[PDB]
Amino acid sequence: MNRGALIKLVESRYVRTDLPEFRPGDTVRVSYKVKEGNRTRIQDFEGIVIRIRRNGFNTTFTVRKVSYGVGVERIFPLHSPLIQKIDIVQRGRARRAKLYFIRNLSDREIRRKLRADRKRIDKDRAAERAAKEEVQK
Amino acid sequence: MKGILGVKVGMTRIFRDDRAVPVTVILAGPCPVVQRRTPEKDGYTAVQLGFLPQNPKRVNRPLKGHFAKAGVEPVRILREIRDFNPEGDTVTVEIFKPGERVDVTGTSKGRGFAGVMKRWNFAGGPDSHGAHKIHRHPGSIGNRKTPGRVYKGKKMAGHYGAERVTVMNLEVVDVIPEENLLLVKGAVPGPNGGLVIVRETKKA
Amino acid sequence: AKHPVPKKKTSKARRDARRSHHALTPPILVPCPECKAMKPPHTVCPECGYYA
Amino acid sequence: MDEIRIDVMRASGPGGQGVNTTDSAVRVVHLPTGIMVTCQDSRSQIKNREKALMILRSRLLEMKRAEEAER
Amino acid sequence: MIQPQTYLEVADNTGARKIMCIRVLKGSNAKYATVGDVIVASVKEAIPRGAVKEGDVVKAVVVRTKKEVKRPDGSAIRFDDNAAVIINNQLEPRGTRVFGPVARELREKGFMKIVSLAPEVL
Amino acid sequence: RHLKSGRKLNRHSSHRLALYRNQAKSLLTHGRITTTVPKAKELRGFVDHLIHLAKRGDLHARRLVLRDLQDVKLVRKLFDEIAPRYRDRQGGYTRVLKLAERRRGDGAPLALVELVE
RNA sequence: CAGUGGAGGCCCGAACCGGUGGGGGAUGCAAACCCCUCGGAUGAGCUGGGGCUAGGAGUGAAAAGCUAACCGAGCCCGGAGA
RNA sequence: GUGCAAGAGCACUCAGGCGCGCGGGAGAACCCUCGCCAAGGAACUCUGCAAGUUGGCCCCGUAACUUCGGGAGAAGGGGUGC
RNA sequence: ACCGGAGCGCUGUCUCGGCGAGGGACCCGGUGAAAUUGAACUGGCCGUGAAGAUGCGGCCUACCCGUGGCAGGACGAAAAGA
RNA sequence: GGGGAGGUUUGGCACCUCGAUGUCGGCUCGUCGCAUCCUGGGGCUGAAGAAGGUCCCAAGGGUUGGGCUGUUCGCCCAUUAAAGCGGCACGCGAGCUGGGUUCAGAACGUCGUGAGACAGUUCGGUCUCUAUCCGCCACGGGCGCAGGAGGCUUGAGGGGGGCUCUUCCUAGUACGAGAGGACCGGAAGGGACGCACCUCUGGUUUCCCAGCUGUCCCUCCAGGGGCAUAAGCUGGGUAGCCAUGUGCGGAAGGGAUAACCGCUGAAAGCAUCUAAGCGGGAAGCCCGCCCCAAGAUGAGGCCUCCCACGGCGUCAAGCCGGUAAGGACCCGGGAAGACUACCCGGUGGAUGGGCCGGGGGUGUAAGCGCCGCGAGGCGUUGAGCCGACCGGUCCCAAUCGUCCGAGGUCU
């Protein structure tokens, strides 16, 4: 019986690793398997990450964005099968976990408040193009 | 009338075909039959199902004889199941096919001497204008000289929870026999470790 | 003095009854490895000592 | 009398412990016209009912005399 | 969650700008009202000589909410303010172009007239 | 009810906190300290942490223990004599023992926090 | 008009004086208190010490308020065992 | 004494003096005092009663009315660290 | 710090409650009161009786003693009814 | 024009209570009545269908939010299946409020020469920590259950629950000139409520991490502590506990029955549902589902374990030590808990604590290097720190031991 964790983890075969890294304070767009009137499509969602609710499996995360004057927030399950392709677009200086303080000041001040983490920027662009050349030859 | 003992192990959500679904993870380990009581020997049909293994030394009780009477490893717990004579010597999660709904009985969490507002979900009283004495009180309880008493079973603050409770019609989700696990429609009485029984519901 | 008040002088009989469970209970002790003295279970003791 | 409802209720004003229990406040209402009147200026409930109506009538009566004189 | 005294923003060009709810149209005694639900509501302010004026009691339907709405696919979504669109008893908008995003829930409610006009059918 | 959580403690916060620090200080000074049964049990887990923390080395771990223990000489004594004595003795750097005595007046049960050896 | 000057039952606000609103207290810590809040705060200001006014009398920015913890007539003795 | 515009205010602290003459545990309802909250924002209710919002300083700005002094800190807004 | 009406801001006043902090309640050791008190071996209903029953009648119900908690009754306490 | 019922109103007597029975509303908590507002069933209709009228049966459950006023009442607003009427000291102040009424202050109107007066108005105005008995809600102790004991059960009896709406298909059919618009049966979504849970959403999380001002201090710089609450302030937060969050219930089905429709059929050659007999038929009655329960003294049942007197009683009934199965004390602890009780564990051991791995929270520690006159920034770094959740490991602590406890009546 001393397996309480593994037991819950066993059911957790619904996992997925195709999903890239991403920490709070960086914009990112996700493809979602949205069902239309009856068919199926992929609604894209461009926006900054505000929260990442880590908790083993079913670890959610939120994204807020401006949309025709209105700021919308969407919470997504990480290992959600409906998540087609989550794509990175720009990363920035976190300096904090949950950053709701953006809600209060959505403006050019948010840009200068969220810098650009050149550290991860390099590691990303470098390891992307460099690993490409290695996989090629 | 299917039946099987088990323990609440925890619960998370899965994905059916494309929609999210909260589900509780039950663990119905092999439960050896201990005594098939017929109406002849007693007065009703049922079966004693053992459960977890046990240190043979702890079971020095005459239970040792009761276990030998059927020749089985000393279990920790055992309960009956009304109107249910199966087969073989052990019941399994094989008994439940995904799609079938089940009744799960368990022991709710103990909230001890809970307040009336906490218990029956009363209303208490005003927080501002009135006296700062009856914020969470039941207020009145009866009439005048008539009846002059109190209706038995009247709702009043007291020990509550930690009792036999039975949720119903929980559809059996994916059942993995590879490990004796059993998923259900989430909400289920008892804490993560309590003994719960699973039976056939009454849809019709 | 206020609202709560005893309606009747409780009968001596009824009073004594209340103190039914009131009775004390003798403490528990056991002979120690050192002296024959009676130590309380799971404990050391003066004029005896202990080990480890 | 079939298109007139008589309401009774506690009075409004002094009277002590009496005015509280002993209602004696009467309000009438001519249903077909919605119009209504009420009295409570007397300790007796019936005394009010009598008057309240005598007024309900006269008030209604004055409308017919005016409406007709309007034609 | 929209309730009696709740002020709501106006997404459409009905001329109204804000309307306090008056009552949620639903069960005999409904408590709240999330996106997709219809409600009676008083117009508390509006643009000059609009199609509808102040005090004009009106029926409308929620389109955006401060309280996030749960999706069956585990998903969720939340706006910055609570807004709605004034409707006819025919259940069609008294106005045309209705700016500001809306929820997908409006689709399963038969307000496709709204989603069509809605630019961001989020 | 909501005891589903960790341990129990009396007094408010800054008090009970300084309390643990106070008992740990004197405990690291005399090694054998008698006190109430409960206080001992909680003082048990607190001290052991400081010990296993001092069992390390880097000055960070030092200053880390400096927060609770204020005397620089006492901590100096911890990294010198106290820690090495308990080398390889992972966990259980201390012992709790029930006393038969009972403090007069309040009838409180007494006990002992002995630095194992 | 500028500068100077420093008036006020003026303003903000502690000491000090006072108690508006709420809560606690109600065999109390207390025979009128505690906490939060609030009025005046150079003035009809507050305060120490020394003095004078008393019972159908005193004093009273007047409530019949106060006059030794209950004043539409103080307290104590006496007529009085009315 | 230091800092906060100043101050006998507030915060910490000298000198000095205290930890208030029942304690030990447990961590139920319930009461006191207190901190927090989704969405809504007075629908509570006899009354926004209570609570909270605003708050100090510097600069910009300030209406009806007016006995021309006022209304004024009207309202509203910007600045504040190193 | 007078009484009424409306509005803005802001909020557990409310929809509607939840969680947490500490001071009491609870257990142990020490000290140890009060009002009240005809006597008690003090159940429910339907009748009943100076007209509102633990105590009379009929019927139903109910092993003995407590600890915690709520206030319906004992026309509960208190004050020889204002 | 006549006869009753009811005991809700006003009124009439003045029989208990003036050595006191707190009076209106509101809140909280309700229970009961049916003369029923709704839903369920039915007869008649000036019932085409829908919708409606009226009468009968029927308490099981349900009976919204707000504006005005102290109001009850009532009018109005939005909605609803409906927004029912009454008992219960016009239920309920040793439960709350105190806005009203019903003390002292004030005023207006008003009467009076006046002092004063008012079912006239107005502003203001002390609501009393300790429950002994019955009652009720929860939890124990003692015995009893004709032998002791452990484990699992039977269910007499009692309790909880019980509501309802809308759209689509049959069908735009039957009916109807048209507009409209069905029963019947099946599907789906919703409101309020109740029980359970923490996966998700979202709250708290009192020292889990980080940042911040002022001050005092260790130790001058860094670094760190105390206090500013009983957290000093701010930002974020696992477990636990939670509703706004997820799950599920109302039934289905059996039986008797209400009004009511009907079969057969007299008395009374016809006729009639009725007097013999029989069938149908309500959300209601019994069962069925969930919970309690052998103090069901009418103490139940099944499985399993121990069993001899060894000394007194001539007899009947007992007494005493050792005992067996088995229980209790003590200890470590627990989503169990006020205490007690219930449950697990006690070296033959993973019970808590410590340590380690993991989850999770925080968001780049310290120190040194480098850039800058500096505040700082960069690298080392997802580092450092790190409660409760999942698991491992005897380093510490559950060491040792003691008391109870049938030898079992008679025919």
Ligand SMILES: [Mg+2]
């Ligand atoms: Mg009080």
Ligand SMILES: [Mg+2]
């Ligand atoms: Mg009462």
Ligand SMILES: [Mg+2]
């Ligand atoms: Mg009068």
Ligand SMILES: [Mg+2]
């Ligand atoms: Mg008159």
Ligand SMILES: [Mg+2]
């Ligand atoms: Mg479109």
Ligand SMILES: [Mg+2]
């Ligand atoms: Mg624990």
Ligand SMILES: [Mg+2]
């Ligand atoms: Mg620790």
Ligand SMILES: [Mg+2]
């Ligand atoms: Mg220090």
Ligand SMILES: [Mg+2]
């Ligand atoms: Mg002045």
Ligand SMILES: [Mg+2]
């Ligand atoms: Mg002034």
Ligand SMILES: [Mg+2]
């Ligand atoms: Mg004065």
Ligand SMILES: [Mg+2]
């Ligand atoms: Mg008070």
Ligand SMILES: [Mg+2]
């Ligand atoms: Mg303030």
Ligand SMILES: [Mg+2]
């Ligand atoms: Mg005199």
Ligand SMILES: [Mg+2]
């Ligand atoms: Mg004076």
Ligand SMILES: [Mg+2]
């Ligand atoms: Mg006199």
